[PDB]
Amino acid sequence: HFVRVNGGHFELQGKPYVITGVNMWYAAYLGAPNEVGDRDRLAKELDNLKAIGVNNLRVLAVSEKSEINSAVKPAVTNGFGNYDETLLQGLDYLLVELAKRDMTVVLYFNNFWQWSGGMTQYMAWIEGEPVQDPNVTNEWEAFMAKSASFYRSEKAQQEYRKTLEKIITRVNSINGKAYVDDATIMSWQLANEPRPGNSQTTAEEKQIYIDWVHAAAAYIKTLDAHHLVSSGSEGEMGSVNDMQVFIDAHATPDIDYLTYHMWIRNWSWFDKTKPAETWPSAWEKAQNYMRAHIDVAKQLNKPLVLEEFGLDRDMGSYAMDSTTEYRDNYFRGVFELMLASLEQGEPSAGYNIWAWNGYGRTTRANYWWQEGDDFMGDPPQEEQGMYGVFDTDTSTIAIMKEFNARFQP
């Protein structure tokens, strides 16, 4: 019983399936059997998530070893081809745990950004030069150009396909299931937020990006003809603000469904220090972004998942006891509009909040993750508490539970 696509919606055993999800990048890490893992916590997190109506996690499948202090440590890939089999047993365990609970997972295999190593880490290994952490340089245009250089590197593509092959052809070491046979996996996903480059991307670079999405999705389908494939794109914003790049990249049959993300604070629509003043304008831009991507989903006749979206705590606090009124009202507005869209038969096929902190805790004064600290939905490139929902965020969890039930057929 795999998750399938039929037009603008997902089906499971021929019944509509709607994604009522969270991002939990570290869920497979939690499954590791060694000191990196926390299997007791993983079971408790999944129990709590299931109790609040979550059916789907979006999870990082692979990381690349990094020496920067904005990235997960340890890594799955300790230089090209040097995979940590003990950490892969954590993915095996996560898949067993999700199956017990009738939850699914979307697994992404790379990262535009630095927090799992990702595309810039590929390039650093190839060139024998260290990664420039954009949290240190504040040189984001240069970072995005460097990350997109990955698509043009034949060596990087060979290693990336090596990595896709290593996971897709895996046998679950616990239950013996081939990954290609495991219905717990909803989708393979090319990367987290792949973009074509920076704001100065050329027409040739846009075409390289489009061709990369097509060829990578085709390659996965050679290994696995039946799991869904998605890109992990943010949408228009992840397409150098060119909706035609989004359309062209995702028009291939091998992309089964569409993704979009929304980052109203990172995109400068919302100012976390002036929330009352900036929310009205930010909400106008968000509702327009949602309609623009629902309209593209109708044109391509594919489901659309808002698989990553979040908002700061009130006044940008990282503290657990800070209020989340702006986040909660944003989530309400998104869920109201998306539920209306689903009622009207449009390809709105659900969501994954960014992100789930659950029982994870920091005791770092500066909220900055260090190796050995609890993993949170906020990865190591962001303060622990920036975007994640803690178990104690009662107001937010009530909204999630309410709408998770309303979105279920």
Residue numbers in the entry: 23 to 431
Text of the article:
Exo-β-mannosidases, hydrolysing non-reducing terminal β-d-mannopyranosidic linkages, are widely distributed carbohydrate-degrading enzymes. All of these exo-β-mannosidases process their substrate using a stereochemically retaining double displacement mechanism that is characterised by the formation of a covalent glycosyl enzyme intermediate (GEI). We show that these probes covalently label exo-β-mannosidases from GH families 2, 5, and 164. Structural studies of the resulting complexes support a canonical mechanism-based mode of action in which the active site nucleophile attacks the pseudoanomeric centre to form a stable ester linkage, mimicking the glycosyl enzyme intermediate.
CmMan5A showed 20% inhibition with both 1 and 2, and stronger 85% inhibition with 3, indicating that binding is enhanced by the presence of the alkyl group. CmMan5A bound to compound 3 gave the highest resolution structure at 1.3 Å. Supporting our hypothesized mechanism of reactivity, compound 3 was covalently linked to E330, the known catalytic nucleophile, through its pseudoanomeric carbon. The ring was found in an OS2-like conformation, providing the first direct evidence that the GEI conformation for GH5 β-mannosidases matches that of GH2 β-mannosidases and GH26 β-mannanases. The amine group from the opened aziridine is found interacting with both the general acid, E215, and an apparent buffer acetate that also interacts with the axial O3. C7 (taking the place of endocyclic oxygen) forms a CH/π interaction (3.4 Å) with W285 while the alkyl chain extends out of the catalytic pocket, forming hydrophobic packing interactions with W285, W135, and a hydrophobic groove between N288 and W289. We speculate that these interactions contribute to the observed tighter binding of compound 3 over compound 2. Indeed, the first four carbons of the alkyl linker display well-localised electron density (B factors of 16–25 Å2), indicating rigid binding and suggesting that a shorter linker may hinder binding into the active site pocket.
